[PDB]
Ligand binder design. Structure first.
Ligand code: NAD
Ligand code: NAD
Lengths: 336, 336
C-alpha cells in the first residue's frame, strides 16, 4: 500500500489541476502523462522529439479513456526558447520538468548542445514558472551528481566532484533552484533519479540505458557487452516509484519544498547479477562479453531514501526483480 | 619590483605570443589590452559592446604606437555564438576570458540574460580553446563564489552557497573548468576577483561600482550614498594587480594550473574609510547621505592571497591608497 500517495491522488481526482510536463514524449514524461490523465488532470505537454517519440504519445492515448485524452494539450516546441516556455506556462498549477538530453557519454561528446538543453532550457522553464506563479515545481535531477563521493549509501547532503558535464548540468539545476527559493521565495523540489527503468524506455540508439539495451539484444540473440569488470553496481528503480515521487512532490507541504530527494529503492545490483536477472525473466516468457570501462561513468550507486520516506511519506513498493517482470512483456510487444 | 612578473614581462617583449582577450572593450579587458600591446604582443579581441565601450578601445589606441596597435585584431561579436568563439581562437596561445555580465542586481532582474553570457558564453569559449588546444586558459571568476561561508579572510578551498543568479554563473565557470581538466586534460586557472578598481571602470549606469560612482558624484557635487551604516568592508584591488595575476596565470607551470586563486590585496577597507580616502586624494587635485543596506549585500569581504603569493609568485604591491592616487587623474579627465 502506498498510503500517502493514495490519499494525494484522491485529492487530485476530486479537485483536478492543470499540470505541465516537459519531456512528455520521452520515457518518464510519457509515464507521468499516463498516470495524470488517468487521474482526470488537465495536462499540457511540451516536447521537441529529440530523444522523445510521437509513438510514446500514441501508446498513452490507447491506455486512457477518450474524455481523459481530451484534457491533454500537446505542444511541439523547445525549452531553449523562452517564448514557448512562457506560452506553455499559462494557467499551469503544477510543473513537472523532465525535458533534458540525458546520458553521461552524450555530455562528454557534445557538452554544448547538452548545456543549452539542460541548463538554459531548465532556467527558461524555471523562470517562466516563477513568473506564472505556479503552485509547485518539481524537476528531474540525477544521482550522477554524487560523482566520486565514496560513501554508500548516498545521502542527499553529501556529494563529491562531478565526473561528467552531465553531472554538472544537473547539479546546476539544483543550485539555480536553491537560489530561486532564496531570491524569489520560489520553492521547488529536485528529484535525483537513480537508474530508472520500465515501459517506454528507449532500447534503440547509441545512448540506450543498460536495461532496455540488454533486453533488446537478448531477444535478438545478439551479444551482451559489459563496460569493465561487471562489478560496477546500481540502484535500479522502476518507473512507478518515480511517478509516486513526482506526484507527492507536486503536492508536498511547503516545508518539504526547497529540498532535494533521492528517488530509488535502496538496493544494490551489480551488472553481473542484472545480466542474470533479465535473462531469467525473459526466459519465463519463452525465447556475454567484457570490454573496457565507460569514461566519466560512476563506480557504485546505492540510494538512501530515508529522507523522502520521512518528509514525503514515500513508500517504494516495486523492487528490481518485480519491475523487470512488469517490463519484459512491454519490450516483447514493442521490439517484435 | 615585481621579480617573477617582471621576468615574465621581459620574456614577452622578446618572444611575442598571440593572446585572445574576451571583454576587451571593458574595464579589465581594455587594461589587459593596454599592457599586452605595450609589450608588443599579438592580441585578438572579442566584444559585443554590451557593457563595454568603443571609446575604451579609442583610449588604448592613443596610448600605444601605431605598430603596436597594428597587432590588435578587433572582432565585434558575441561569446554566445560558438562559431565566432572558434574563429577568434585559431592560432591563439593564451586565453584571457573576461567577457561576462557583472552585477548581482542585474542578475536578479534578468537571470536569463546573465545565464546566457556567463555560462553558455563561458562554456563556448572554454570548449573552443579546448578544441584549438591553446597553451593557457585563464578566466575571470568572482569572490561571490564564497556565498554564505562565514570565514574571513576568504580562503579558496572553503566556499558556501551561492547567493544570487550571478553567483551561480561564476561558480559554474569553476565547475566546468574542473570538469574540462578531468575529462579532456585541459587545465585552466580561474581568478576570483575582489572589488577591482582603476582607469576605465565605468562610473555611469545603474550598476556602477562604488569607487567610480562616488568619484563621479564628488566631482559633480551629487549625493554620496552609503548603503547601510558604513562599516561594511571590502578588499579593493587596483587593476595593475589583476593585470599581474592574469599574465602570471597565462604563463604558469602545469602544476600551478587547474587551480583557483583569490586576486586581491589581503586588506579590508570600510566604506566610511573609503569615502574619506576618495575625498582626500580628489582634493589634492583641487575640486554624504545614509540609507538602507542594499538587499543581499555582503557585510565583510577580505581575501587571503597566500596561495597566489605562494604558487604563482604574486605580489600585491598596490594598496588602496596608492591605487586611488593613480586613478583619480583618469577620472578628472574622463569627466570634464
Ligand atoms: N532515465 C534515467 O535513468 C534518468 C536518470 C537520471 C536523470 N534522468 C533525467 O530524467 C529526465 C527524463 O529522462 P528520460 O529517462 O525520460 O529520457 P528521455 O530521453 O526518454 O526523455 C527526455 C525527453 O525530453 C525531450 N527533450 C529533450 N530536450 C528537449 C528540449 N530542448 N525541448 C523540449 N523537449 C526536449 C526529449 O524529446 C525526450 O522526450 C531527464 O532530465 C533525464 O536527464 C533520467
Ligand atoms: N570589476 C570587478 O570588481 C569584478 C569582480 C568580480 C568579477 N569581475 C569579472 O571580471 C570580468 C570583466 O569585468 P569588468 O569589471 O571589466 O566588466 P566590464 O563590464 O567593464 O567588461 C565586461 C566586458 O565583456 C563584454 N561582454 C559582455 N557580454 C559579452 C558577450 N556575450 N560577448 C562578447 N562580449 C561580452 C562587455 O561588452 C564588456 O566589454 C567579468 O567577467 C566580471 O564578471 C569583475
Amino acid at each position: 500500500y502506498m498510503s500517502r500517495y493514495e490519499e494525494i491522488t484522491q485529492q487530485l481526482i476530486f479537485s483536478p489541476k492543470t499540470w505541465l510536463i516537459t519531456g512528455v514524449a520521452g520515457f518518464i514524461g510519457s509515464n507521468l502523462l499516463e498516470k495524470l490523465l488517468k487521474l482526470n488532470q488537465v495536462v499540457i505537454g511540451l516536447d521537441n522529439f529529440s530523444t522523445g517519440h510521437q509513438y510514446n504519445l500514441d501508446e498513452v492515448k490507447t491506455l486512457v479513456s477518450t474524455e481523459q485524452w481530451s484534457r491533454f494539450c500537446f505542444i511541439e516546441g523547445d525549452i531553449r526558447d523562452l517564448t514557448t516556455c512562457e506560452q506553455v506556462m499559462k494557467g499551469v498549477d503544477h510543473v513537472l520538468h523532465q525535458a533534458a538530453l540525458g546520458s553521461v557519454p552524450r555530455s562528454i561528446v557534445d557538452p554544448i548542445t547538452t548545456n543549452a538543453t539542460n541548463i538554459t532550457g531548465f532556467l527558461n522553464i524555471l523562470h517562466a514558472a516563477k513568473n506564472a506563479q505556479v503552485q509547485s515545481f518539481t524537476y528531474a535531477a540525477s544521482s550522477s551528481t554524487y560523482g566520486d563521493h565514496p560513501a554508500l549509501p548516498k545521502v542527499e547532503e553529501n556529494i563529491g566532484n562531478p565526473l561528467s558535464p552531465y553531472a554538472v548540468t544537473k547539479y546546476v539545476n539544483e543550485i539555480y533552484a536553491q537560489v530561486y527559493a532564496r531570491t524569489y521565495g520560489f520553492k521547488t523540489i529536485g528529484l535525483r533519479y537513480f537508474n530508472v527503468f520500465g515501459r517506454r524506455q528507449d532500447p534503440n540508439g547509441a545512448y540506450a540505458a543498460v536495461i532496455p539495451k540488454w533486453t533488446a539484444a537478448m531477444l535478438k540473440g545478439d551479444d551482451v557487452y559489459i563496460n569493465g569488470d561487471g562489478e560496477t553496481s546500481r540502484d535500479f528503480c522502476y518507473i512507478d516509484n518515480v511517478i509516486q515521487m513526482n506526484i507527492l512532490s507536486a503536492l508536498a507541504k511547503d516545508s518539504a519544498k526547497d529540498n532535494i530527494y533521492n528517488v530509488a529503492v535502496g538496493d544494490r545490483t551489480t551488472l553481473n547479477e542484472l545480466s542474470g536477472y533479465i535473462y531469467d525473466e525473459l526466459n519465463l516468457i519463452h525465447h556475454i562479453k567484457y570490454r573496457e570501462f565507460r569514461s566519466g561513468d560512476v563506480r557504485h550507486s546505492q540510494a538512501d531514501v530515508t529522507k523522502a520516506i520521512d518528509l514525503l511519506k514515500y513508500r517504494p513498493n516495486i523492487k528490481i526483480r518485480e519491475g523487470l517482470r512488469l517490463s519484459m512483456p512491454w519490450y516483447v510487444r514493442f521490439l517484435k
